């Protein structure tokens, strides 16, 4: 609730903005509009582009590479809005930038933003 304080990850609620994997999420958690943590809601199109972050997992003390992928071709969901910025760099380091609509590669050239999934893509560093 203190938005300026260091962000404190938890590994117990994926729909909350402090879930560990959402460390550099921007927009809306897909799990809140019929997607899941790592899948898009029906009717939307999964981008192949991502921005990444190394997100600390309180649980195993390990850092994981989370490659956020957008689910596209719908109007923004309006549910579980979240913006975190752990390790988020400015647009000129696009690989780590999260204002960008990461919808590239999405079916049907879908480019509108609906929500963001939080898959692990490897070990950090």
């Amino acid at each position: 609730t203190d938005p300026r304080a260091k962000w404190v990850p938890q590994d117990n609620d994926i729909q909350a903005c402090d879930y560990w994997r959402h460390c550099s999420i921007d927009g809306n958690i897909c799990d809140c509009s019929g997607g899941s943590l790592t899948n898009c809601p029906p009717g939307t199109k999964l981008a192949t582009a991502s921005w990444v972050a190394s997100c600390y997992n309180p649980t195993d003390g390990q850092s994981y590479l989370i490659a956020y992928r957008d689910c596209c071709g719908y109007n923004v969901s309006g549910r579980c809005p979240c913006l975190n910025t752990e390790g988020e760099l400015p647009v000129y380091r696009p690989e780590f930038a999260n204002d960008i609509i990461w919808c590239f590669g999405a079916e049907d050239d879908a480019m509108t933003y609906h929500c963001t999934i939080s898959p692990i893509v490897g070990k950090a560093s």
């Binding site: 790592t38 192949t48 582009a49 991502s50 921005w51 990444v52 994981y64 590479l65 490659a67 690989e95 780590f96 590239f104 590669g105 079916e107 898959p119 692990i120 893509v121 490897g122 070990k123 560093s125």
Partner: protein, 354 residues
């Protein structure tokens, strides 16, 4: 034990007596000094290899044997994609089924038949003893058993830590023992956020325990013909290499022109690239991917020829969803990718980088 079995395959592997003229062994083409690939120049450069007979050329580039032991046995998964197997077209199920084919392939080792392979195994007293200790007395007197035991010993040898040592810089960085240079780390980041990690990673998500930079799947990335390699193979200018569709049993035309996703381990030291050796430089291999994304004149051009890439040898079943990422790799990212790939070279081949 698996020690002894592997030790027997290690003898067989360097033994030219399993070729017709006794001029060549697995090691002639899969030269351990070159990440188990062929250093020898032919009628088609290093694009394809020359068999025992001194003139027959293959129509495919000799792949590394490093890490081939990590590939699953051939299978179709529940989302309907074939995965695993051996050869560029997955026509062998595994290392065992693969091993014997070079021995009997006329354009390679060219033994007439299994019996001739057995006869040669009987000429060496040390084979009588090694084989018999592992498979029982008179194994070498039965061609079928001999040949199969040979293929098994070869496969075991290729499953030793020697072929898959995971001592590359990439492995050492992921163990926390060292760091990537800024450029390598950029390349790693680019590799995992761009379309590359949709085919050149074991898993779709989560962390792989023994990463070999291939999901083992089959994709037609739309490569043209290697015109000289094709000329040297004498397969004919009519001939189309349909990759996976060539595996017996595969009938589905969606698989025509699809090839197994090579493991990128040691990629820096096993040029030329792709199933046909068409690209001599790693950088070319990477730039090839821009042809689906870049709108710039130069992306249509193969930098090694100065001319257009050429139509695909097989102009259907292109992996367009994956390849048309919508994003073009600039020079910087291509540089960073080269750096990243180079970190996938085994410790013993670090000198080969230069």
């Amino acid at each position: 034990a698996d020690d002894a079995l592997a030790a027997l395959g290690a003898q067989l592997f360097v033994d030219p007596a399993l070729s017709r003229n006794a001029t060549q062994s697995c090691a002639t083409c899969h030269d351990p000094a070159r990440a188990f690939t062929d250093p020898r120049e032919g009628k088609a450069g290093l694009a394809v290899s020359v068999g025992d007979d001194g003139q027959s050329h293959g129509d495919r580039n000799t792949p590394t044997l490093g890490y081939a032991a990590l590939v699953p046995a051939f299978h179709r998964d529940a989302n309907g994609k074939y995965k695993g197997g051996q050869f560029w077209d997955g026509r062998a199920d595994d290392l065992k089924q693969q091993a014997g084919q070079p021995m009997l392939n006329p354009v390679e080792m060219a033994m007439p038949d299994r019996a001739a392979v057995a006869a040669r195994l009987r000429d060496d007293p040390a084979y009588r003893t090694g084989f018999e200790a592992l498979f029982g007395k008179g194994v070498l007197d039965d061609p079928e058993r001999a040949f199969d035991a040979a293929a098994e010993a070869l496969a075991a040898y290729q499953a030793t830590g020697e072929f898959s040592p995971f001592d590359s810089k990439y492995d050492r960085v992921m163990r926390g023992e060292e760091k990537f240079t800024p450029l390598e780390e950029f390349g790693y980041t680019v590799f995992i956020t761009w379309n590359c990690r949709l085919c050149h990673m074991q898993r779709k998500q989560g962390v792989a325990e023994r990463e070999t930079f291939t999901n083992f799947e089959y994709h037609n990335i739309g490569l043209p013909v290697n015109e000289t390699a094709r000329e040297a193979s004498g397969l004919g200018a009519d001939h189309v290499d349909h990759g996976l569709l060539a595996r017996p049993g595969i009938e589905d035309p969606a698989q025509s022109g699809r090839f197994k996703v090579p493991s990128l381990r040691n990629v820096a030291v096993t040029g030329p690239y792709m199933h046909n050796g068409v690209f001599t430089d790693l950088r070319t291999a990477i730039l090839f991917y821009n042809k689906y994304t870049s709108r710039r004149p130069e992306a249509k051009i193969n930098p090694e020829t100065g001319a257009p890439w050429g139509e695909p040898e097989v102009a259907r079943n292109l992996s367009l969803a994956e390849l048309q990422s919508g994003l073009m790799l600039d020079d910087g990212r291509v540089d960073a990718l080269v750096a990243f790939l180079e970190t996938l070279t085994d410790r013993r081949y670090e000198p080969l980088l230069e």
